[PDB]
mmCIF file of all heavy atoms in Angstrom:
data_model
loop_
_atom_site.group_PDB
_atom_site.id
_atom_site.type_symbol
_atom_site.label_atom_id
_atom_site.label_comp_id
_atom_site.label_asym_id
_atom_site.label_seq_id
_atom_site.Cartn_x
_atom_site.Cartn_y
_atom_site.Cartn_z
ATOM 1 N N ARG W 1 128.258 137.383 136.596
ATOM 2 C CA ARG W 1 129.021 136.496 135.721
ATOM 3 C C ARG W 1 129.905 137.276 134.758
ATOM 4 O O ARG W 1 130.962 136.779 134.354
ATOM 5 C CB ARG W 1 128.086 135.569 134.945
ATOM 6 C CG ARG W 1 126.701 135.456 135.539
ATOM 7 C CD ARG W 1 125.801 134.545 134.728
ATOM 8 N NE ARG W 1 125.986 133.142 135.071
ATOM 9 C CZ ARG W 1 125.138 132.178 134.728
ATOM 10 N NH1 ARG W 1 124.045 132.474 134.040
ATOM 11 N NH2 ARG W 1 125.378 130.923 135.081
ATOM 12 N N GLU W 2 129.498 138.487 134.374
ATOM 13 C CA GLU W 2 130.361 139.306 133.530
ATOM 14 C C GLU W 2 131.496 139.938 134.323
ATOM 15 O O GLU W 2 132.564 140.201 133.761
ATOM 16 C CB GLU W 2 129.547 140.380 132.809
ATOM 17 C CG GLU W 2 129.782 140.399 131.305
ATOM 18 C CD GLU W 2 128.681 141.107 130.545
ATOM 19 O OE1 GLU W 2 127.524 140.647 130.615
ATOM 20 O OE2 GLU W 2 128.972 142.112 129.864
ATOM 21 N N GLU W 3 131.288 140.196 135.616
ATOM 22 C CA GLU W 3 132.424 140.483 136.483
ATOM 23 C C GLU W 3 133.358 139.284 136.542
ATOM 24 O O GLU W 3 134.584 139.438 136.518
ATOM 25 C CB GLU W 3 131.947 140.867 137.885
ATOM 26 C CG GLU W 3 131.950 142.362 138.161
ATOM 27 C CD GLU W 3 130.735 142.812 138.949
ATOM 28 O OE1 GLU W 3 130.131 141.967 139.642
ATOM 29 O OE2 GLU W 3 130.388 144.009 138.878
ATOM 30 N N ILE W 4 132.791 138.078 136.606
ATOM 31 C CA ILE W 4 133.598 136.867 136.492
ATOM 32 C C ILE W 4 134.246 136.793 135.118
ATOM 33 O O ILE W 4 135.436 136.478 134.993
ATOM 34 C CB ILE W 4 132.737 135.623 136.780
ATOM 35 C CG1 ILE W 4 132.749 135.303 138.270
ATOM 36 C CG2 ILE W 4 133.220 134.426 135.976
ATOM 37 C CD1 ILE W 4 131.882 134.130 138.639
ATOM 38 N N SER W 5 133.479 137.098 134.068
ATOM 39 C CA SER W 5 133.985 136.968 132.705
ATOM 40 C C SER W 5 135.207 137.849 132.484
ATOM 41 O O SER W 5 136.228 137.392 131.956
ATOM 42 C CB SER W 5 132.884 137.315 131.704
ATOM 43 O OG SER W 5 131.747 136.491 131.894
ATOM 44 N N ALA W 6 135.123 139.119 132.888
ATOM 45 C CA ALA W 6 136.268 140.011 132.752
ATOM 46 C C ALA W 6 137.471 139.480 133.521
ATOM 47 O O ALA W 6 138.594 139.472 133.004
ATOM 48 C CB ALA W 6 135.901 141.416 133.229
ATOM 49 N N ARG W 7 137.251 139.001 134.746
ATOM 50 C CA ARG W 7 138.348 138.515 135.571
ATOM 51 C C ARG W 7 138.810 137.124 135.152
ATOM 52 O O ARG W 7 140.004 136.819 135.254
ATOM 53 C CB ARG W 7 137.927 138.531 137.040
ATOM 54 C CG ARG W 7 137.488 139.912 137.502
ATOM 55 C CD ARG W 7 136.837 139.886 138.875
ATOM 56 N NE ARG W 7 137.033 141.152 139.575
ATOM 57 C CZ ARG W 7 136.323 142.251 139.340
ATOM 58 N NH1 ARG W 7 135.362 142.240 138.426
ATOM 59 N NH2 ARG W 7 136.570 143.362 140.022
ATOM 60 N N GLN W 8 137.893 136.273 134.682
ATOM 61 C CA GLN W 8 138.304 134.987 134.126
ATOM 62 C C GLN W 8 139.143 135.169 132.870
ATOM 63 O O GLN W 8 140.033 134.357 132.594
ATOM 64 C CB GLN W 8 137.085 134.118 133.816
ATOM 65 C CG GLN W 8 136.690 133.165 134.931
ATOM 66 C CD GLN W 8 135.494 132.306 134.566
ATOM 67 O OE1 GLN W 8 134.945 132.416 133.470
ATOM 68 N NE2 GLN W 8 135.080 131.445 135.490
ATOM 69 N N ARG W 9 138.870 136.217 132.095
ATOM 70 C CA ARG W 9 139.660 136.540 130.916
ATOM 71 C C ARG W 9 140.897 137.366 131.240
ATOM 72 O O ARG W 9 141.781 137.490 130.386
ATOM 73 C CB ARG W 9 138.798 137.289 129.892
ATOM 74 C CG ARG W 9 137.664 136.456 129.315
ATOM 75 C CD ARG W 9 136.849 137.242 128.301
ATOM 76 N NE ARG W 9 136.953 138.685 128.505
ATOM 77 C CZ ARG W 9 135.954 139.454 128.924
ATOM 78 N NH1 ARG W 9 134.769 138.920 129.189
ATOM 79 N NH2 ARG W 9 136.137 140.759 129.081
ATOM 80 N N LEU W 10 140.984 137.927 132.444
ATOM 81 C CA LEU W 10 142.163 138.677 132.849
ATOM 82 C C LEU W 10 143.194 137.814 133.563
ATOM 83 O O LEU W 10 144.309 138.287 133.813
ATOM 84 C CB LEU W 10 141.761 139.850 133.744
ATOM 85 C CG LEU W 10 141.212 141.081 133.015
ATOM 86 C CD1 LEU W 10 140.937 142.193 134.012
ATOM 87 C CD2 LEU W 10 142.136 141.553 131.894
ATOM 88 N N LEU W 11 142.852 136.570 133.900
ATOM 89 C CA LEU W 11 143.818 135.611 134.421
ATOM 90 C C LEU W 11 144.344 134.658 133.363
ATOM 91 O O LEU W 11 145.466 134.160 133.500
ATOM 92 C CB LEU W 11 143.210 134.810 135.575
ATOM 93 C CG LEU W 11 142.994 135.646 136.832
ATOM 94 C CD1 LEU W 11 142.688 134.755 138.014
ATOM 95 C CD2 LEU W 11 144.244 136.463 137.095
ATOM 96 N N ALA W 12 143.558 134.379 132.320
ATOM 97 C CA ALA W 12 144.141 133.838 131.099
ATOM 98 C C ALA W 12 145.160 134.811 130.531
ATOM 99 O O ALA W 12 146.120 134.401 129.867
ATOM 100 C CB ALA W 12 143.049 133.545 130.071
ATOM 101 N N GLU W 13 144.962 136.102 130.791
ATOM 102 C CA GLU W 13 145.932 137.133 130.472
ATOM 103 C C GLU W 13 147.002 137.317 131.538
ATOM 104 O O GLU W 13 147.959 138.060 131.299
ATOM 105 C CB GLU W 13 145.223 138.464 130.239
ATOM 106 C CG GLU W 13 145.290 138.902 128.813
ATOM 107 C CD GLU W 13 146.700 139.290 128.464
ATOM 108 O OE1 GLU W 13 147.175 140.305 129.001
ATOM 109 O OE2 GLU W 13 147.338 138.594 127.649
ATOM 110 N N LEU W 14 146.870 136.684 132.703
ATOM 111 C CA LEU W 14 147.965 136.710 133.666
ATOM 112 C C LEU W 14 148.897 135.521 133.481
ATOM 113 O O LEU W 14 150.111 135.647 133.680
ATOM 114 C CB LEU W 14 147.426 136.740 135.101
ATOM 115 C CG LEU W 14 148.426 137.166 136.183
ATOM 116 C CD1 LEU W 14 147.726 137.949 137.281
ATOM 117 C CD2 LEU W 14 149.172 135.973 136.774
ATOM 118 N N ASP W 15 148.352 134.365 133.105
ATOM 119 C CA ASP W 15 149.182 133.210 132.801
ATOM 120 C C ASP W 15 149.817 133.290 131.420
ATOM 121 O O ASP W 15 150.728 132.508 131.133
ATOM 122 C CB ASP W 15 148.369 131.920 132.921
ATOM 123 C CG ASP W 15 148.239 131.447 134.357
ATOM 124 O OD1 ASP W 15 148.099 132.302 135.255
ATOM 125 O OD2 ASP W 15 148.288 130.221 134.588
ATOM 126 N N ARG W 16 149.366 134.208 130.562
ATOM 127 C CA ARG W 16 150.039 134.400 129.282
ATOM 128 C C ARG W 16 151.245 135.322 129.403
ATOM 129 O O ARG W 16 152.202 135.178 128.636
ATOM 130 C CB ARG W 16 149.062 134.925 128.225
ATOM 131 C CG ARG W 16 149.038 134.042 126.980
ATOM 132 C CD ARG W 16 147.952 134.394 125.974
ATOM 133 N NE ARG W 16 147.880 135.820 125.682
ATOM 134 C CZ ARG W 16 146.807 136.569 125.910
ATOM 135 N NH1 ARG W 16 145.715 136.021 126.425
ATOM 136 N NH2 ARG W 16 146.822 137.863 125.621
ATOM 137 N N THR W 17 151.228 136.264 130.347
ATOM 138 C CA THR W 17 152.437 136.994 130.702
ATOM 139 C C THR W 17 153.286 136.256 131.729
ATOM 140 O O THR W 17 154.425 136.667 131.976
ATOM 141 C CB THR W 17 152.098 138.390 131.239
ATOM 142 O OG1 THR W 17 153.276 138.980 131.806
ATOM 143 C CG2 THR W 17 151.014 138.314 132.295
ATOM 144 N N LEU W 18 152.761 135.187 132.330
ATOM 145 C CA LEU W 18 153.540 134.355 133.242
ATOM 146 C C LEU W 18 154.543 133.474 132.517
ATOM 147 O O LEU W 18 155.306 132.757 133.175
ATOM 148 C CB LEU W 18 152.607 133.491 134.094
ATOM 149 C CG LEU W 18 153.072 133.170 135.517
ATOM 150 C CD1 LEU W 18 153.819 134.349 136.127
ATOM 151 C CD2 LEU W 18 151.897 132.763 136.396
ATOM 152 N N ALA W 19 154.544 133.489 131.187
ATOM 153 C CA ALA W 19 155.603 132.881 130.401
ATOM 154 C C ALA W 19 156.405 133.907 129.617
ATOM 155 O O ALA W 19 157.428 133.550 129.024
ATOM 156 C CB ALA W 19 155.025 131.837 129.436
ATOM 157 N N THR W 20 155.964 135.165 129.600
ATOM 158 C CA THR W 20 156.699 136.252 128.968
ATOM 159 C C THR W 20 157.679 136.905 129.938
ATOM 160 O O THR W 20 158.775 137.304 129.532
ATOM 161 C CB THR W 20 155.721 137.292 128.412
ATOM 162 O OG1 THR W 20 154.876 136.671 127.437
ATOM 163 C CG2 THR W 20 156.476 138.429 127.743
ATOM 164 N N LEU W 21 157.304 137.022 131.216
ATOM 165 C CA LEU W 21 158.284 137.389 132.235
ATOM 166 C C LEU W 21 159.406 136.366 132.298
ATOM 167 O O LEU W 21 160.578 136.720 132.465
ATOM 168 C CB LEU W 21 157.621 137.501 133.608
ATOM 169 C CG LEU W 21 156.380 138.358 133.833
ATOM 170 C CD1 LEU W 21 155.893 138.162 135.256
ATOM 171 C CD2 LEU W 21 156.681 139.819 133.572
ATOM 172 N N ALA W 22 159.058 135.084 132.170
ATOM 173 C CA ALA W 22 160.046 134.024 132.324
ATOM 174 C C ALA W 22 161.068 134.043 131.194
ATOM 175 O O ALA W 22 162.255 133.792 131.427
ATOM 176 C CB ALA W 22 159.346 132.668 132.397
ATOM 177 N N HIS W 23 160.636 134.348 129.972
ATOM 178 C CA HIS W 23 161.532 134.249 128.826
ATOM 179 C C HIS W 23 162.362 135.502 128.583
ATOM 180 O O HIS W 23 163.115 135.537 127.605
ATOM 181 C CB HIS W 23 160.749 133.890 127.566
ATOM 182 C CG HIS W 23 160.207 132.496 127.577
ATOM 183 N ND1 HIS W 23 159.606 131.920 126.480
ATOM 184 C CD2 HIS W 23 160.192 131.554 128.551
ATOM 185 C CE1 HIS W 23 159.238 130.688 126.777
ATOM 186 N NE2 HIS W 23 159.580 130.441 128.029
ATOM 187 N N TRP W 24 162.257 136.517 129.442
ATOM 188 C CA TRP W 24 163.158 137.660 129.332
ATOM 189 C C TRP W 24 164.467 137.393 130.064
ATOM 190 O O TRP W 24 165.553 137.603 129.511
ATOM 191 C CB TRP W 24 162.494 138.925 129.882
ATOM 192 C CG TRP W 24 163.315 140.155 129.629
ATOM 193 C CD1 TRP W 24 163.703 140.637 128.415
ATOM 194 C CD2 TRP W 24 163.882 141.035 130.609
ATOM 195 N NE1 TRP W 24 164.460 141.770 128.574
ATOM 196 C CE2 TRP W 24 164.587 142.037 129.912
ATOM 197 C CE3 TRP W 24 163.856 141.080 132.007
ATOM 198 C CZ2 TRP W 24 165.259 143.070 130.561
ATOM 199 C CZ3 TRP W 24 164.527 142.109 132.652
ATOM 200 C CH2 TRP W 24 165.217 143.089 131.928
ATOM 201 N N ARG W 25 164.382 136.930 131.314
ATOM 202 C CA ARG W 25 165.585 136.568 132.056
ATOM 203 C C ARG W 25 166.299 135.401 131.391
ATOM 204 O O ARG W 25 167.517 135.437 131.178
ATOM 205 C CB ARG W 25 165.236 136.191 133.494
ATOM 206 C CG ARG W 25 166.299 135.297 134.130
ATOM 207 C CD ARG W 25 165.808 134.577 135.368
ATOM 208 N NE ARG W 25 164.781 133.596 135.038
ATOM 209 C CZ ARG W 25 164.988 132.284 135.001
ATOM 210 N NH1 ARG W 25 166.189 131.791 135.281
ATOM 211 N NH2 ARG W 25 163.995 131.463 134.686
ATOM 212 N N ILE W 26 165.547 134.349 131.057
ATOM 213 C CA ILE W 26 166.145 133.096 130.615
ATOM 214 C C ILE W 26 166.852 133.280 129.279
ATOM 215 O O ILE W 26 167.662 132.435 128.882
ATOM 216 C CB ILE W 26 165.048 132.016 130.574
ATOM 217 C CG1 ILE W 26 165.609 130.607 130.423
ATOM 218 C CG2 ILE W 26 164.167 132.220 129.388
ATOM 219 C CD1 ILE W 26 164.494 129.570 130.383
ATOM 220 N N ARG W 27 166.574 134.383 128.581
ATOM 221 C CA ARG W 27 167.364 134.814 127.431
ATOM 222 C C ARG W 27 168.460 135.786 127.863
ATOM 223 O O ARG W 27 169.640 135.574 127.574
ATOM 224 C CB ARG W 27 166.451 135.452 126.377
ATOM 225 C CG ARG W 27 167.123 136.503 125.502
ATOM 226 C CD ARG W 27 166.216 136.958 124.364
ATOM 227 N NE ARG W 27 165.011 137.647 124.823
ATOM 228 C CZ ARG W 27 164.982 138.905 125.252
ATOM 229 N NH1 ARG W 27 166.099 139.617 125.310
ATOM 230 N NH2 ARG W 27 163.834 139.448 125.637
ATOM 231 N N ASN W 28 168.075 136.857 128.562
ATOM 232 C CA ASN W 28 169.020 137.844 129.086
ATOM 233 C C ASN W 28 169.667 137.295 130.356
ATOM 234 O O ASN W 28 169.408 137.742 131.474
ATOM 235 C CB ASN W 28 168.320 139.169 129.358
ATOM 236 C CG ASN W 28 169.267 140.346 129.307
ATOM 237 O OD1 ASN W 28 170.455 140.191 129.015
ATOM 238 N ND2 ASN W 28 168.747 141.536 129.588
ATOM 239 N N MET W 29 170.528 136.303 130.159
ATOM 240 C CA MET W 29 171.154 135.565 131.245
ATOM 241 C C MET W 29 172.666 135.625 131.085
ATOM 242 O O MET W 29 173.199 135.258 130.033
ATOM 243 C CB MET W 29 170.668 134.114 131.263
ATOM 244 C CG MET W 29 170.948 133.390 132.563
ATOM 245 S SD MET W 29 170.586 131.631 132.449
ATOM 246 C CE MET W 29 169.995 131.306 134.107
#
């Protein structure tokens, strides 16, 4: 479950950069 915990917390960290990648282009356009 702690292997799950690290990875469950690393995809909340993947969807938080999934809006930071988006806002670089959409500004630098």
Side-chain angles (χ1 to χ4, degrees):
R1 342 179 84 165
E2 232 161 299
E3 259 140 23
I4 271 178
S5 303
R7 303 170 151 79
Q8 266 181 0
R9 295 180 336 249
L10 281 184
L11 290 193
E13 249 291 292
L14 197 146
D15 279 37
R16 235 172 47 241
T17 169
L18 212 36
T20 300
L21 308 175
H23 291 188
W24 187 60
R25 157 197 67 104
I26 193 180
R27 152 172 65 77
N28 205 3
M29 197 189 214

